[PDB]
Amino acid sequence: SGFRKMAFPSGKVEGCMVQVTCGTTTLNGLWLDDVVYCPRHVICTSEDMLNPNYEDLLIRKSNHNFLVQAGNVQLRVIGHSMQNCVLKLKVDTANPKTPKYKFVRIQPGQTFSVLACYNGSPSGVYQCAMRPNFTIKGSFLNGSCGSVGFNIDYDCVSFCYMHHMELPTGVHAGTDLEGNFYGPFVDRQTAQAAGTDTTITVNVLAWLYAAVINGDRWFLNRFTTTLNDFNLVAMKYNYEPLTQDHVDILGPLSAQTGIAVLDMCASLKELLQNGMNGRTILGSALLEDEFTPFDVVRQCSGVT
Amino acid sequence: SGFRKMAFPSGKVEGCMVQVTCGTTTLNGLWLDDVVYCPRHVICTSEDMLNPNYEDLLIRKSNHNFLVQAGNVQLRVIGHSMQNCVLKLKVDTANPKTPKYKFVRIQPGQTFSVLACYNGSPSGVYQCAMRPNFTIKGSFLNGSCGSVGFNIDYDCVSFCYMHHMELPTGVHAGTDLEGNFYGPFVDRQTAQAAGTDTTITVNVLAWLYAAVINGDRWFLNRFTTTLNDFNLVAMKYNYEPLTQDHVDILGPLSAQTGIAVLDMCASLKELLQNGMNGRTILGSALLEDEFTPFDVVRQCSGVT
Ligand SMILES: Cc1cc(NC(=O)Cc2cncnc2)cc(O[C@H]2CC(=O)N2)c1
Numbered sequence: 203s204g205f206r207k208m209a210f211p212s213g214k215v216e217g218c219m220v221q222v223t224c225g226t227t228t229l230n231g232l233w234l235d236d237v238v239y240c241p242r243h244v245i246c247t248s249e250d251m252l253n254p255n256y257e258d259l260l261i262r263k264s265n266h267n268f269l270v271q272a273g274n275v276q277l278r279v280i281g282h283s284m285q286n287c288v289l290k291l292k293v294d295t296a297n298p299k300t301p302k303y304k305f306v307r308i309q310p311g312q313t314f315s316v317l318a319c320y321n322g323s324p325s326g327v328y329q330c331a332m333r334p335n336f337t338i339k340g341s342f343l344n345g346s347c348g349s350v351g352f353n354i355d356y357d358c359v360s361f362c363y364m365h366h367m368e369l370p371t372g373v374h375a376g377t378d379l380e381g382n383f384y385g386p387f388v389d390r391q392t393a394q395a396a397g398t399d400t401t402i403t404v405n406v407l408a409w410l411y412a413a414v415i416n417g418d419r420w421f422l423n424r425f426t427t428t429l430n431d432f433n434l435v436a437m438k439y440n441y442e443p444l445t446q447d448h449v450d451i452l453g454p455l456s457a458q459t460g461i462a463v464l465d466m467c468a469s470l471k472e473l474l475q476n477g478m479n480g481r482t483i484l485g486s487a488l489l490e491d492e493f494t495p496f497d498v499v500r501q502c503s504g505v506t
Numbered sequence: 507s508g509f510r511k512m513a514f515p516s517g518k519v520e521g522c523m524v525q526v527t528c529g530t531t532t533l534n535g536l537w538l539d540d541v542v543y544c545p546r547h548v549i550c551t552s553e554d555m556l557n558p559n560y561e562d563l564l565i566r567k568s569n570h571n572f573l574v575q576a577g578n579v580q581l582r583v584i585g586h587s588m589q590n591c592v593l594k595l596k597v598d599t600a601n602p603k604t605p606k607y608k609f610v611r612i613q614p615g616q617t618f619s620v621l622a623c624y625n626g627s628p629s630g631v632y633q634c635a636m637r638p639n640f641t642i643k644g645s646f647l648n649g650s651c652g653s654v655g656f657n658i659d660y661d662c663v664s665f666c667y668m669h670h671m672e673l674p675t676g677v678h679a680g681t682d683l684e685g686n687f688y689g690p691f692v693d694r695q696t697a698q699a700a701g702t703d704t705t706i707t708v709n710v711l712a713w714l715y716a717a718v719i720n721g722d723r724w725f726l727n728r729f730t731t732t733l734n735d736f737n738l739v740a741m742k743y744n745y746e747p748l749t750q751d752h753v754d755i756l757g758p759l760s761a762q763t764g765i766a767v768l769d770m771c772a773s774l775k776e777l778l779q780n781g782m783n784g785r786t787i788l789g790s791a792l793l794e795d796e797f798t799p800f801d802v803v804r805q806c807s808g809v810t
């Protein structure tokens with residue numbers, strides 16, 4: 203029993219972290235096979251960041267200008283290219299610690315672990331959700347760019363995120379491993395609006411099932427609702443509308459607890475309308491939305 | 507910016523996890539050098555757990571009865587001994603993945619990362635605090651015994667916890683790596699009282715400094731207090747009394763924010779007396795106490 207914001211074991215990703223230096227800028231790179239991936243803004247100086255012409259900036263760079271270090275050993279750069287907002291530095295050595303991996307573009311509402319890095323060295327690991335507005339509420343400082351988000355299935359690491367920037371609002375923006383930003387963000391030092399964010403309804407319901415599994419049942423009530431009635435409440439409270447796809451994904455948790463999904467929706471409706479009355483659910487005084495139905499089942503079943 | 511319950515990168519500890527089987531029982535072991543450490547209750551059957559005589563049970567066991575597996579390879583057990591509540595299985599092979607390590611007995615209020623394991627395989631990593639009542643509020647299921655808690659300084663892993671049991675209340679109990687339980691707990695299936703727990707005052711203050719550093723300043727006020735006045739409030743709300751040692755440890759955070767520790771105490775006093783009024787601090791609707799002053803500085807400075 204117990205429920206925690208649990209991250210994947212980070213070992214397979216730690217063995218991929220390298221430091222990338224271009225001129226005066228140092229950030230993190232991801233070394234998989236004979237390729238090192240990093241944010242393309244590593245080629246920018248302070249004056250460039252305000253409105254960079256990455257194509258022009260990258261033209262003044264040669265392979266020998268990209269300094270790639272894996273721990274204490276230097277890697278030899280034999281090729282360089284830009285793919286969207288990432289640079290791909292071809293090195294002459296395949297990473298012997300390269301795990302089985304895939305590059306995936308996660309959906310909003312999905313979760314992943316972040317291995318925060320500085321100078322190619324891992325500092326910590328935490329679990330994040332890709333917000334509906336395509337931002338992540340991470341913990342990153344200057345030098346953290348190039349840190350990655352991932353999921354692990356058996357022995358396969360699915361890299362889904364690479365950190366690029368912090369918006370003036372303190373939230374984080376980044377790309378998939380092909381360098382395509384999540385959201386409308388551009389890699390330029392201009393104020394950028396992240397959209398209105400919503401609460402991930404299916405995740406809050408999944409966490410309510412996790413609460414029931416762990417003995418916290420006070421919020422359960424004698425009520426039910428319909429998808430339409432519940433969605434009127436969800437819109438009022440900036441929650442994502444619940445669909446039959448979400449109800450179907452909640453199926454295993456509904457079967458495990460014996461609580462019909464629409465009955466759980468009625469509990470959530472009452473919690474939204476009346477608050478928590480100074481009580482807690484799984485040690486939290488607010489409705490948690492950064493656990494997917496899969497995360498709940500995995501945590502509550504002990505998947506290794 | 508941003509503040510998360512960040513765990514240490516778990517890689518150095520993943521390379522130490524093994525599976526230990528004795529008869530019908532399987533749990534996790536920690537392989538360091540040529541020794542495997544695991545909870546001694548691995549030698550118990552269902553009937554034994556209620557009141558085990560570990561000395562008598564261990565006498566009926568030989569080296570060949572302890573089945574130790576590291577991934578897919580079997581380790582040869584050449585010695586076995588009991589040290590308090592842990593078994594030490596001497597194997598004929600030193601772990602080639604053994605990091606620089608120490609065994610430490612952490613103090614209550616201190617934090618550590620837990621690598622939750624099943625069948626010797628890591629499933630996840632999360633940050634915990636050793637509660638003042640010597641319990642941990644973890645996330646563990648059957649099979650998780652033998653999972654360890656640790657801290658990392660540079661390249662040195664300080665193992666501080668080994669998981670042994672879940673009390674009927676859902677909280678967790680375990681030992682240091684010499685097998686000495688934290689708290690009054692015994693490894694027997696009898697209902698055990700964990701003491702009254704208190705909130706780790708110095709950690710809540712450290713987290714309030716983390717909030718100020720990250721822009722959340724609403725709770726700051728025009729008041730101050732004394733250690734004695736603040737401690738009268740702390741006792742009323744089941745908070746640990748604040749000492750000059752705690753004020754001194756908060757020194758760097760006080761210097762960084764320019765907020766005198768007793769002024770932060772007055773903010774905490776008002777938050778205790780008046781609640782949060784439906785507002786949040788670092789995305790939390792309750793006062794967080796599982797971040798030490800060291801964790802705040804480390805996270806807010808990017809220590810790798
Ligand atoms: C190419 C680029 C890089 C960075 N760098 C950073 O944030 C560095 C960093 C990352 N994370 C936490 N702390 C620090 C900012 C950029 O624009 C700001 C304007 C906006 O919005 N974002 C644009």
Ligand SMILES: Cc1cc(NC(=O)Cc2cncnc2)cc(O[C@H]2CC(=O)N2)c1
Binds near residue numbers: 648670672694697698
């Ligand atoms: C030697 C021993 C082992 C276990 N085993 C477990 O809890 C297994 C486990 C661990 N963590 C989470 N879920 C499951 C319990 C014991 O006594 C209970 C009476 C009490 O209090 N504790 C005594």
